[PDB]
Structure formats: C-alpha cells, structure tokens
C-alpha cells in the first residue's frame, strides 16, 4: 500500500550486529574500562582532546562541544551521571527514532549538525567538504578510525564529489544508515575499524 502520505522506515534495534556496533563504541568511550561513561568525559574528549589536537578555533571548538552535548543528551545522558551500556543502548533507540522522524520530515537532525561541526574545522571554504588526508587525521585524533587503510575504505565506500572529496551530506546519509537503522548500504563505512 502507498501508506497514504507516510513513509515506512526500517529500524533493526534487536539485531545483534547493531548491538555489537554500539557496544564496540561504548567500550571505546569507556576508557578506564569500568563499564560506565559520563557526559562529562564525552565533552572533554571533544574539546580538551580532539579539538585541541586539531587546533580548532575557540568558536569551532564550542560549536562541536555543543553538538556533542546535544547528541548524547539525546541518548538520555546528563553531566554528573554515570551510565551503563544497557541504558546507553536504549537511549540510542529513542534518539534514532526521533532523528529518523525529523529526517523524514526534512527537519534538522543532531547527526547533521555534528557533521557540520567536524567538517567546518577542516573545510576552509565552509562548504562541508573534507579530503582523505583530513579524515585520516580525524580518524587518528578521535581514535574512531586510526588505520589509514580503514579511512581509505571510507572514501572508497562513499560517493565522492568530482575532485574525490567527501561531502557532509553524503556522510550524514551514511551515518543514518550506520548508527540508526543498520542499512546494508552503510556496511563498511569505517572499513574494519568499526563493525
Ligand atoms: O559519527 C561520528 N562519531 C560517532 C561516535 C559514536 C559514539 C558512540 C556510539 O555508540 C556510536 C557512535 N563517536 C565518535 C567519536 C567521538 C565521540 C564523542 C566525542 C567526540 C568524538 C564519532 N565521530 C564521528 C563524527 C562525525 C559525525 C558526523 C559526520 O558527518 C562526520 C563525522 O565521526 O565518526
Ligand atoms: Na568508564
């Protein structure tokens, strides 16, 4: 049926591959290996660590911190509260549901704004475009994708602009499928760095 001006979107929140994916990332954020994380740690990872090592400007650093802050609050996190993976994953279920609704209605999403924040640190033209070399640097500083081979797979996997560079809107589409819905078209986005 035509759904009568609705669109049917698939989620896969009970698929073990989606659980493993976010479990992989939880462990990566759980640096002290105690099975708990805090919004405080995350925002400090964003500004005190990533943005400092990239040498983002103060305003660029604040925009990134605010987007990181708003994104993981979307998962039910709050500064001063430790959180464990099972409530982390349920937060992601809610975040993904609300984000997909806004995407379908052409409204701003937290994932897009986070992308805009990362790209603008690298892109001198302010057009949301980055190069393989810039992504490799982010992959190494954030730690999500330190392998150059994994980063090349990212550009191999995405559709690039006519000069071989990566647009923020392509990466946002990829991220919706990779983190929210387990779209098979997004498998391989980080090479072998992220399952
Ligand atoms: O998507 C991204 N990430 C997702 C998760 C993450 C964390 C936990 C999960 O359960 C799942 C995913 N963690 C980090 C790394 C990070 C985390 C916190 C603070 C700073 C950096 C991270 N960096 C991003 C930034 C990004 C965003 C949009 C773009 O268009 C391009 C790049 O690029 O991949
Ligand atoms: Na921890």
Author numbering: 1 to 195
Paper text:
The binding of calcium ions to the photoprotein molecule initiates decarboxylation of 2-hydroperoxycoelenterazine yielding a protein-bound product, coelenteramide, in an excited state.
To elucidate the structural basis of the influence of mutations on the bioluminescent properties of the photoproteins, we have also determined the crystal structure of the OL_H64F mutant in conformation before the bioluminescence reaction. The crystal structure of the OL_H64F mutant contains two photoprotein molecules per asymmetric unit. The OL_H64F mutant, similar to the wild-type photoproteins and their various mutants, is a globular molecule with the radius of ~25 Å. The electron densities detected at the Ca2+-binding loop I in both protein chains A and B (residues 29–37) are conditioned by the bound Na+, just as it was found in the wild-type obelin and Ca2+-discharged obelin-v. Although the coordination geometry is typical for both calcium and sodium ions, no calcium was added to the crystallization solution and hence the ion was recognized as sodium. Thus, the comparison of the OL_H64F mutant structure with those of the wild-type obelin and the OL_Y138F mutant certainly evidences that the substitution of His to Phe does not change the overall structure of this mutant. As expected, similar to the OL_Y138F mutant, the main changes in the substrate-binding cavity of the OL_H64F mutant occur near the N1 atom of the 2-hydroperoxy adduct of coelenterazine. It should be noted that Phe is found in the same position as His in the wild-type obelin and the OL_Y138F mutant, i.e., the side chain of Phe does not drastically disturb the structure of this part of the inner cavity.
